[PDB]
Design a protein around this motif. Structure first.
Motif, PDB file in Angstrom:
ATOM      1  N   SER A  80       1.844 -50.836  25.891  1.00  0.00           N
ATOM      2  CA  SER A  80       2.355 -51.687  25.522  1.00  0.00           C
ATOM      3  C   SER A  80       2.138 -52.590  24.318  1.00  0.00           C
ATOM      4  CB  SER A  80       1.120 -52.566  26.638  1.00  0.00           C
ATOM      5  OG  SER A  80       0.008 -52.910  25.498  1.00  0.00           O
ATOM      6  N   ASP A 129       4.442 -59.542  30.589  1.00  0.00           N
ATOM      7  CA  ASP A 129       4.377 -60.692  30.374  1.00  0.00           C
ATOM      8  C   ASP A 129       4.323 -61.572  28.627  1.00  0.00           C
ATOM      9  OD1 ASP A 129       2.122 -60.255  29.358  1.00  0.00           O
ATOM     10  OD2 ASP A 129       0.929 -61.776  29.900  1.00  0.00           O
ATOM     11  N   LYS A 130       4.366 -60.373  27.574  1.00  0.00           N
ATOM     12  CA  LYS A 130       4.205 -60.481  26.517  1.00  0.00           C
ATOM     13  C   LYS A 130       5.448 -60.456  25.838  1.00  0.00           C
ATOM     14  CE  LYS A 130       0.821 -58.326  25.904  1.00  0.00           C
ATOM     15  NZ  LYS A 130       0.238 -58.610  27.605  1.00  0.00           N
ATOM     16  N   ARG A 166     -10.550 -54.690  30.098  1.00  0.00           N
ATOM     17  CA  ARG A 166      -9.170 -55.541  29.416  1.00  0.00           C
ATOM     18  C   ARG A 166      -8.667 -56.276  29.758  1.00  0.00           C
ATOM     19  NH1 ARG A 166     -10.628 -52.698  26.182  1.00  0.00           N
ATOM     20  NH2 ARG A 166      -9.929 -49.796  25.176  1.00  0.00           N
ATOM     21  N   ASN A 167      -8.565 -56.680  31.392  1.00  0.00           N
ATOM     22  CA  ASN A 167      -8.421 -57.901  31.854  1.00  0.00           C
ATOM     23  C   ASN A 167      -9.048 -59.274  31.448  1.00  0.00           C
ATOM     24  OD1 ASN A 167      -7.616 -55.268  33.167  1.00  0.00           O
ATOM     25  ND2 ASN A 167      -8.855 -56.434  35.320  1.00  0.00           N
ATOM     26  N   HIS A 177      -5.505 -53.521  22.340  1.00  0.00           N
ATOM     27  CA  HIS A 177      -7.104 -53.465  22.410  1.00  0.00           C
ATOM     28  C   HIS A 177      -7.687 -52.144  21.832  1.00  0.00           C
ATOM     29  CE1 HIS A 177      -4.882 -55.998  25.106  1.00  0.00           C
ATOM     30  NE2 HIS A 177      -5.471 -57.253  24.448  1.00  0.00           N
ATOM     31  N   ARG A 224      -1.525 -66.229  34.863  1.00  0.00           N
ATOM     32  CA  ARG A 224      -0.703 -66.321  33.605  1.00  0.00           C
ATOM     33  C   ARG A 224       0.397 -67.688  33.914  1.00  0.00           C
ATOM     34  NH1 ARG A 224      -1.774 -60.934  31.617  1.00  0.00           N
ATOM     35  NH2 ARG A 224      -3.670 -60.224  32.743  1.00  0.00           N
ATOM     36  N   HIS A 274      -4.540 -53.304  41.183  1.00  0.00           N
ATOM     37  CA  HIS A 274      -3.239 -52.736  41.225  1.00  0.00           C
ATOM     38  C   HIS A 274      -3.179 -52.016  42.422  1.00  0.00           C
ATOM     39  CE1 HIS A 274      -4.963 -51.375  37.514  1.00  0.00           C
ATOM     40  NE2 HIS A 274      -3.824 -51.277  36.912  1.00  0.00           N
ATOM     41  N   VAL A 306      -7.391 -59.141  27.144  1.00  0.00           N
ATOM     42  CA  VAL A 306      -5.837 -59.455  26.671  1.00  0.00           C
ATOM     43  C   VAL A 306      -5.777 -60.754  27.554  1.00  0.00           C
ATOM     44  CG1 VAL A 306      -4.311 -59.252  29.943  1.00  0.00           C
ATOM     45  CG2 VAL A 306      -3.852 -58.627  27.035  1.00  0.00           C
ATOM     46  N   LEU A 356       1.555 -57.542  35.473  1.00  0.00           N
ATOM     47  CA  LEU A 356       1.201 -58.646  34.552  1.00  0.00           C
ATOM     48  C   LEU A 356       1.355 -58.669  33.012  1.00  0.00           C
ATOM     49  CD1 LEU A 356       0.124 -59.815  36.821  1.00  0.00           C
ATOM     50  CD2 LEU A 356      -2.517 -59.919  35.537  1.00  0.00           C
ATOM     51  N   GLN A 357       1.552 -57.770  32.342  1.00  0.00           N
ATOM     52  CA  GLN A 357       1.860 -56.784  31.043  1.00  0.00           C
ATOM     53  C   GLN A 357       3.356 -57.095  30.754  1.00  0.00           C
ATOM     54  OE1 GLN A 357       2.311 -52.782  29.535  1.00  0.00           O
ATOM     55  NE2 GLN A 357       0.618 -52.917  28.892  1.00  0.00           N
ATOM     56  N   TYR A 417      -6.190 -57.724  38.549  1.00  0.00           N
ATOM     57  CA  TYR A 417      -5.345 -57.525  37.731  1.00  0.00           C
ATOM     58  C   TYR A 417      -4.110 -56.933  38.105  1.00  0.00           C
ATOM     59  CZ  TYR A 417      -2.968 -55.035  34.511  1.00  0.00           C
ATOM     60  OH  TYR A 417      -2.013 -54.952  32.755  1.00  0.00           O
ATOM     61  N   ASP A 440      -2.342 -49.602  24.513  1.00  0.00           N
ATOM     62  CA  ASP A 440      -2.787 -50.816  23.188  1.00  0.00           C
ATOM     63  C   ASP A 440      -2.826 -51.345  22.330  1.00  0.00           C
ATOM     64  OD1 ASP A 440      -5.001 -51.170  23.914  1.00  0.00           O
ATOM     65  OD2 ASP A 440      -4.822 -51.552  26.573  1.00  0.00           O
ATOM     66  N   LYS A 446      -0.769 -54.231  37.336  1.00  0.00           N
ATOM     67  CA  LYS A 446      -0.243 -54.006  35.643  1.00  0.00           C
ATOM     68  C   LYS A 446       1.334 -54.307  35.587  1.00  0.00           C
ATOM     69  CE  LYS A 446      -0.557 -50.447  32.474  1.00  0.00           C
ATOM     70  NZ  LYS A 446      -1.786 -50.844  31.399  1.00  0.00           N
TER      71      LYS A 446
HETATM   72  N1  LIG Z   1      -5.724 -51.492  33.885  1.00  0.00           N
HETATM   73  C1  LIG Z   1      -5.806 -52.385  32.830  1.00  0.00           C
HETATM   74  N2  LIG Z   1      -7.010 -52.828  33.163  1.00  0.00           N
HETATM   75  N3  LIG Z   1      -4.667 -53.240  31.793  1.00  0.00           N
HETATM   76  C2  LIG Z   1      -5.280 -53.828  30.984  1.00  0.00           C
HETATM   77  C3  LIG Z   1      -4.317 -54.084  29.922  1.00  0.00           C
HETATM   78  C4  LIG Z   1      -3.691 -54.791  29.746  1.00  0.00           C
HETATM   79  C5  LIG Z   1      -2.013 -55.252  29.257  1.00  0.00           C
HETATM   80  N4  LIG Z   1      -2.182 -54.456  27.756  1.00  0.00           N
HETATM   81  C6  LIG Z   1      -1.253 -56.465  29.348  1.00  0.00           C
HETATM   82  O1  LIG Z   1      -0.988 -57.166  28.870  1.00  0.00           O
HETATM   83  O2  LIG Z   1      -1.023 -56.798  29.867  1.00  0.00           O
END
Ligand SMILES: NC(=[NH2+])NCCC[C@H](N)C(=O)O
Ligand SMILES: NC(=[NH2+])NCCC[C@H](N)C(=O)O
Ligand SMILES: NC(=[NH2+])NCCC[C@H](N)C(=O)O
Ligand SMILES: NC(=[NH2+])NCCC[C@H](N)C(=O)O
Lengths: 450, 449, 449, 448
Positions: free
Chosen positions: B11, B314-315, B97-98, B73, B222, A147, B101, B311-312, B307, B71, B309
């Motif tokens: 998400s 992407d799904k 989480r990075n 997770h 990605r 971020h 996911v 990147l989310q 990472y 999410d 945000k």
């Molecule tokens: N701040 C974080 N590490 N967030 C992880 C969440 C990622 C989110 N669910 C995604 O698919 O991209």
């Protein structure tokens, strides 16, 4: 206009001339086949082949009569050959159509373009691995982001090797694209083969193709390979746009992590410490024209009935641009990266902030059985108090850390000062100087630097 | 405000899809924790016991999906702990989480890509059977160039043109699949971890080829997603050329083939007018997949490392593209076998009075006439036949043989489709002789005997 | 199931439900017209009309029988009216085709949505103006960037007003987009009007359209408006993506210029100096999906033969998604801007660096009579010498200046300090507080605050 | 790697296209320096005479374009100083390449859109001419739906659909034009100037409605370029739709029209083959414009405020899009008039034996029968016809009254396209009188 506007509008010579070598090579090969097959007399092939050399000399010497009125590179070389060697010239295009002729030239041209691109990527992956080493000796560390907010500390070495993996995957996409498009459409004629005693396996071999295409219709109508290459090129620039972005950032007064080489920047007289990264900016920005190309050609081939269609001519311009873009981008980054001047200290003060390593202290408790979340709160209060007292994490004492929570011991101390805390994340792929070095070995053996 | 910012970040809405994947990496993850000491044998038993209840719960539609946890997770985690107690809070140890996911997405695309390879295989098989069908009685239609009648082509040849196209699409799906099958789990948030975690254990147990060797790359990259979306596009694009052609060949104007009732719609009144709805939708859907590729490319351009945000985003696109291609591969493999091609109409179209005149030219050419000249010659003869209102077939030996001393008996067979289609027998051509070997060959690559 | 899949694949109800209102409001105006023209008796008009009111109730109650087997919102709403009012129901769709109907609905739905968008944009520009005025006094200054390199000191008020200009032009695009799609296609019926004595000027007038479309073919086949609206949304998110980029950046520990309100960020358990701008990240990243949407749709209509085709169905999903993205984005932004903390000192310190104001010093000499070039060498030499003397531009004495160049004199001293120098660029549209206060006032009368 | 970078950074290769606009802006800027008092009269009336030489040189091919200088801006300047001496180096007083290049692009597009508008008015003008021409003996071809014969439609009507389309295109371009006609010149590097610069003066003389109100915005915005590309994309998209149809109607299968020799290709071997080469290219070129729009968008996404080198990727895609739409707009106006529509094959296909069986349903239903059933009644009829191998032009009033009592004598004219083609007379309908009406509306909108 309007008959002229039409002519101009239809012509492809303005851009297809870039493939004159591929057209020449095919010509020799195809002419040689016509002979082997009985369609051309030895006397004739001899002339065609003699005439083809003069054409190439004329082209390399800027004396070839490039005529737009002749529409494309194909008729241009042909017309010329016939001017140089009378009748024989008019037999070179026997048993052939522009359709299978174009697709062969384009594929031929991409294989070369790709091989030159793969060459350019090896060089880049080399400067990377080389730069990783140059900044692993006097250990260079900086903040890892998330971020765009500093998180755990990372090594420039691990960072360069990040783009190493990325650029390596790119090389594999261009490779697989290359291999897959290495079939020959030559011999498919307009769309259905011919009655002519043609030999496609011969033409395929002599031209570098693994084998001749198995379906004349697809041979002439396919361009999916152009699309596959354009995507490879798209993803590649995206990787390069990532790096340009970070170098452009770390190049700001705010970060102060790195100085870009004067060769690839512009400064300011009346200004002292100002230097603009134009080249890095243009690389970042050029990712769009490459995306623009992929979109353009996909829209072209959508709902496009089968076999040749003039729409298909819209395939060359995007590629030549996309390739040149990615070509020149890879070349610059390799000439610029090693000229980079990283300000070690400013990076180190940034990586080891005031309490960033506290993350480590939290993990420490967790490993010993303290619920990692539970540990995140106890560790938090710790720093929270440190702030209240205006002290850094480097000043904590073992006794003081022991009062906080019993789990801590003599071993926790080395985790307060970056100097020793970095050696912590030693898992496969971590930033720890041991894991990074281990990886810098592979990279070395892989690109053959050692 | 307030909740908007919550739903906006959530998400969960679409990442539920990767529930099976997440569930799976959790087991493999926990098991690894146990293998490295971080987890008590009694804790793993509980964890594994709870994860089963979860699977059973989700499957039953009785599992609790809480958007508040944002999410998939954390949803599975909140629930695990709600069921197993303290052990739950330990599952997410030495993991971020990075990397979590990431492992999930590529773990899911491997399975998706498998279902898709299975579909393409199926689809190629029916093209080949459809090819064998219209090969014996012998179906022939005009080959097109600029959408104008070019040269007689064998319908069997036509199916094979797509056989090679879809075959190449598998190659891209395969090669893309093989490249993303690296494991990012065990990479923490971006750098590695200090915990005595083992990434080879997880990579291996989770099906991956091996662990990714760079934590930064592993949670930021990605590009695999973009390599799949690229293939899906080229894949859908191939399907649009086929759909477009079927929508064209089934008009009253062409009249070459009739679409199955199951995939079209009509109107009691007009007996003809048979709207090919499924194919149009298939054709128009190439758009979404293109858009998905653009969307994601845009998202990742100039994105600082690690990472983010972003990147989310992407799904959602993938899920849609995957869904569009899959559904299209199924529908065509269901629709194509039921096509009714109109042999006679197709055969007449192919032999449009003088389409074979191009055969006479090659004839002269092969005997010795230049070719540009051979062309002028048959054209002067063609003009004469149109003038006298005569079709190419009604020409006679001596008359043809009169027009140019090079024409001989052996040329006669070239004036009628019946025998001319046996003409272009070069490797890859439409001559039955030839299409037959490319047809045997195909059958073997997919299941013949 | 093949037959099953076929139906699902074609079903549009999943997303056209969103248009139940417009389709409803339409069913009303169309019936009232069918009556006023004689195709319906008052006893029929009243019947249908009341059936619709009930439906609006069943829908806004969660009791409406949303049935997929019915394919779309049009027949779902219809099938029901025949279940509520009986026989008169089956006449509601007279002299109307699903063609001119679905199109009328969409054009109607966007018009409403644009107005919402316009309110949201209008709201946002007010907040931009509030914040500008707020940070004008006390006077907030920060670096004006170029190549993401400090260029010349700028005012937060000017920054804000910049975006003001941007959002002002976006709304305008939305205006002209709406007023252009505000022509009615109802009554084109499939393509070509009808023999039915329909009054399309009636339905056009009573449904808010400035008029009914002049050509039935165009009326049924066009979607260029959907494409125009999408483009506006694209440019809109792009403008936003830029502001999002600068807040994500300005809030980093490196720049330290601003702090994001917790309502729209995330943090850490064992840290506090960290604050993640998730929403701003997501806002920036989602500019991709709107772009991908424009691309999706443009690719659907390229080379599309005329009249209606099943291909058009592909228009709704993309629009709904882009419109929702831009909408929530305009909302989150409005709520987020007024609550962030701009660091006065840090910013001012960064604006007036060591010698950044030296540029004003050269413009001085140039205005006096030194070729704008020459003057650079001079002041450059001046700075170069100050860098060595280890001194700041804020230390030059009138003496030293007159020594460097005779053209310097008293009135040049105020160019040496920021507090007095931000009054320099007082040209129209400049950053001098004199100028900004003038555009801020103008901007206020404009957005009525 | 010096040359590589230089070339990579240079914009001259393409930005030289905007020389006219750069020369015009210099003259105004100078005129304003003198006014404002930053240039003696001697100086201005020297820079000007030098800007005239530069024009003559550029138009004659003797002007020295140097890649080394990077852009068009420096190139002209370098020549000014070279040609006039010291006065030359004061032309760039109180100005940045930033406010300068932004201006030049805006100047270029304006003239560009105006050119495009004229081409649209020229195309719409022939479309209207064609509509008329084909109303005289009266042309009818089938309207399609799913590319299936739907309801007979008037060729003239067909041309007017595209007239409404281009009409909207002209509108997007027209609105895009004036929204971007506000001079950014004067914003300097990113903020104004301490120089007594006059911004309204420049704007006026340069055709602008006014000066942009914010230095930052003015120097950083490309939304106008994004807007123009979008209009181009949508317009080109309209052309591809028409192109596709002409390619389709000229196939041997449809056989409705022939493409003029001057825009086609063929073979003496197969004298019935005629390739719509230009039309296929006009169709295909819908893609590069799409891509132009995408690329420029990707460039501006997440791009920090003020100038950034990235913004140099704005001219190339725009130049390529403009030339594309431009030429496409011209070719068609030259192509359409030469087309040869085959009145009969068209007419014939329109009336396909049952086609008008739809007019009987709209009959029964208008006569009071609930449409859902009326349409169901006529089904029985057509069905019984296919079985009897009979048409619908053969139907007799009795057979009608036989099938359903609501059938009167006023319904017989609904079986022969000759007469039935007058049914659809609602506003915007395909019925001759409807069309004939719109056609006069259009003539007036342009030239009767
Ligand atoms: N701040 C974080 N590490 N967030 C992880 C969440 C990622 C989110 N669910 C995604 O698919 O991209
Ligand atoms: N009518 C034809 N077969 N034309 C083939 C021309 C292909 C064109 N020269 C190209 O480069 O795409
Ligand atoms: N065959 C037809 N006329 N179908 C009209 C249905 C259109 C569909 N609901 C859409 O939104 O595109
Ligand atoms: N550093 C600068 N101010 N550069 C301005 C150059 C702009 C460049 N000629 C372009 O057309 O985009």
């Amino acid at each position: 206009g309007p008959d002229a506007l039409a002519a101009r509008f239809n012509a492809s010579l303005a851009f297809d001339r870039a493939l004159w070598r591929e057209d020449l090579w095919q010509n020799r090969v195809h002419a040689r086949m016509l002979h082997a097959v009985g369609l051309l007399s030895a006397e004739e092939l001899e002339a065609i082949l003699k005439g083809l050399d003069r054409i190439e000399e004329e082209i390399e010497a800027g004396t070839f009569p490039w005529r737009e009125e002749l529409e494309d590179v194909h008729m241009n070389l042909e017309a010329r050959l016939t001017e140089l060697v009378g009748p024989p010239g008019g037999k070179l295009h026997t048993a052939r159509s522009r359709n299978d002729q174009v697709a062969t030239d384009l594929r031929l041209y991409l294989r070369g373009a790709i091989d030159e691109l793969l060459a350019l990527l090896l060089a880049l992956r080399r400067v990377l691995v080389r730069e990783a080493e140059k900044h692993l000796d006097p250990l260079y560390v900086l903040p890892g982001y998330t971020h765009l907010q500093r998180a755990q500390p990372v090594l420039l070495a691990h960072w360069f090797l990040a783009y190493y993996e990325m650029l390596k995957r790119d090389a594999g996409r261009l490779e697989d694209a290359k291999e897959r498009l290495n079939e020959s459409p030559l011999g498919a004629a307009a769309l259905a083969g011919t009655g002519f005693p043609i030999d496609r396996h011969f033409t395929a071999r002599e031209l570098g193709f693994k084998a001749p295409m198995r379906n004349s219709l697809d041979a002439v109508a396919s361009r999916d390979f152009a699309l596959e290459v354009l995507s490879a090129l798209n993803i590649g620039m995206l990787h390069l746009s990532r790096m340009a972005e970070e170098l452009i950032l770390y190049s700001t007064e705010e970060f102060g992590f790195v100085e870009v080489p004067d060769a690839f920047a512009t400064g300011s007289s009346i200004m002292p410490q100002k230097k603009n990264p134009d080249i890095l900016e243009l690389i970042r920005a050029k990712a769009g024209r490459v995306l623009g190309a992929f979109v353009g050609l996909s829209a072209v081939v959508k709902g496009l009935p089968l076999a040749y269609n003039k729409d298909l001519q819209e395939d060359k311009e995007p590629l030549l641009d996309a390739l040149a873009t990615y070509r020149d981008s890879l070349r610059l980054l390799a000439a610029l990266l090693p000229g980079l001047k990283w300000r070690r200290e400013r990076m180190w003060r940034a990586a080891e902030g005031g309490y960033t390593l506290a993350t480590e202290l939290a993990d420490y408790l967790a490993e010993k059985g303290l619920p990692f979340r539970e540990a995140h709160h106890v560790v938090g209060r710790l720093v929270r108090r440190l702030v209240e007292e205006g002290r850094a994490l480097k000043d904590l004492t073992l006794e003081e850390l022991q009062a906080h929570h019993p789990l801590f011991a003599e071993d926790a101390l080395p985790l307060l000062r970056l100097e020793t805390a970095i050696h912590r994340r030693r898992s496969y792929g971590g930033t720890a100087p041991e894991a990074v070095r281990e990886r810098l070995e592979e990279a070395k053996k892989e690109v053959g630097l050692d």
